[PDB]
Design an enzyme around this catalytic site. Structure first.
Site, mmCIF file in Angstrom:
data_model
loop_
_atom_site.group_PDB
_atom_site.id
_atom_site.type_symbol
_atom_site.label_atom_id
_atom_site.label_comp_id
_atom_site.label_asym_id
_atom_site.label_seq_id
_atom_site.Cartn_x
_atom_site.Cartn_y
_atom_site.Cartn_z
ATOM 1 C CG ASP A 93 49.717 39.655 38.730
ATOM 2 O OD1 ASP A 93 50.928 40.017 38.822
ATOM 3 O OD2 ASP A 93 49.163 38.931 39.618
ATOM 4 C CB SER B 144 33.987 34.089 39.744
ATOM 5 O OG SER B 144 34.136 33.925 41.161
ATOM 6 C CG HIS C 61 30.791 29.867 40.685
ATOM 7 N ND1 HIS C 61 32.130 29.556 40.841
ATOM 8 C CD2 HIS C 61 30.707 31.233 40.803
ATOM 9 C CE1 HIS C 61 32.813 30.659 41.066
ATOM 10 N NE2 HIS C 61 31.998 31.700 40.972
ATOM 11 C CG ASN D 232 33.383 39.365 43.212
ATOM 12 O OD1 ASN D 232 34.245 39.566 42.345
ATOM 13 N ND2 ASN D 232 32.613 38.278 43.214
HETATM 14 CA CA LIG Z 1 51.189 38.267 40.808
#
Ligand SMILES: [Ca+2]
Ligand SMILES: [Ca+2]
Length: 279
Positions: free
Chosen positions: A200, A224, A69, A161
């Site tokens: 954001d 991720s 990962h 997720n």
């Molecule tokens: Ca932020």
């Protein structure tokens, strides 16, 4: 520069439209920046890292990525073929075990580690940290991310997720860092992506091809995979002098593709990371 038949996410971050196949980017490619990948580690020997990756800390018995990962995430940051910022330096901090799990105390220590360790590295264009990890809300985990940001590091974190509001996850819910949702190649919010006012920015996160352990590659999906797109884009923009660690998230938001995504819940930003590169 132009990488033809690039991974769809690389193409997407250099286009105003979905469905393109070429990654257009400035050749400076993040040279002179540094990105810490706080994860399961990085297989620094992978050919795709070209000697630009190294492990700097582990919280486990070995520094080796026994999972994949962290290697994958690091590939999307800065590998040659799979990376956004193809000449950045990569630093591995192993706070997750080889099953991908970790305790919040370790994760916190890893963040405070980067805040200090960056002061002993030569990163003339600035420092980024990519955190493709998290769990349920923790004020201590959020405080750690806020401290890392405050120290002069561009912190990018996965939204999670759970197809739920990221307010209930950490470090996603820390307002001062850059919280990244996932999209797919058809500009839909990814089916598993968290949402909410704290996000954001979105980056590509469904079916992302990158490096894997054993000198291999694979496609996987998650917030991720979106996070390191943003972290590499930050390093890229910081090397170009367009923005700083403190301002990069806001910069990326302001220069995003706006209104491109579908299945964005009202109150969540419709903003897709975009490099605004013109040859
Ligand atoms: Ca932020
Ligand atoms: Ca568009």
């Amino acid at each position: 520069a132009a990488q033809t038949n690039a991974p769809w996410g690389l193409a997407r971050i250099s286009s105003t439209s979905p469905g393109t196949s070429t990654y257009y980017y400035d050749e400076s490619a993040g040279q002179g920046s540094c990105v810490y990948v706080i994860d399961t580690g990085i297989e620094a020997s992978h050919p795709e890292f070209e000697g630009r990756a190294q492990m700097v800390k582990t919280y486990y018995y070995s520094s080796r990525d026994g999972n994949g990962h962290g290697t994958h995430c690091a590939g999307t940051v800065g590998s040659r073929t799979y990376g956004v910022a193809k000449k950045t330096q990569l630093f591995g901090v192993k706070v997750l075990d080889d099953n991908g799990s970790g305790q919040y105390s370790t994760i916190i220590a890893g963040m405070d580690f980067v805040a200090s360790d960056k002061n002993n590295r030569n990163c003339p264009k600035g420092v980024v940290a990519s955190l493709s990890l998290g769990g349920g809300y923790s004020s201590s985990v959020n405080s750690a991310a806020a401290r890392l940001q405050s120290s002069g590091v561009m912190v990018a974190v996965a939204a999670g997720n759970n197809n739920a509001d990221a307010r209930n996850y950490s470090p996603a819910s820390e307002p001062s860092v850059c919280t990244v949702g996932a999209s797919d190649r058809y500009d839909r919010r990814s089916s598993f992506s968290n949402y909410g006012s704290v996000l954001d920015i979105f980056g590509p996160g469904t079916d992302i091809l990158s490096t894997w352990i054993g000198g291999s590659t694979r496609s996987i999906s998650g917030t991720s995979m979106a996070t390191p797109h943003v972290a590499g884009l930050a390093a890229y923009l910081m090397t170009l002098g367009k923005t700083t660690a403190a301002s990069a998230c806001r910069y990326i938001a302001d220069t995003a593709n706006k209104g491109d995504l579908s299945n964005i819940p009202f109150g969540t930003v419709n903003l897709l990371a975009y490099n605004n590169y013109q040859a």
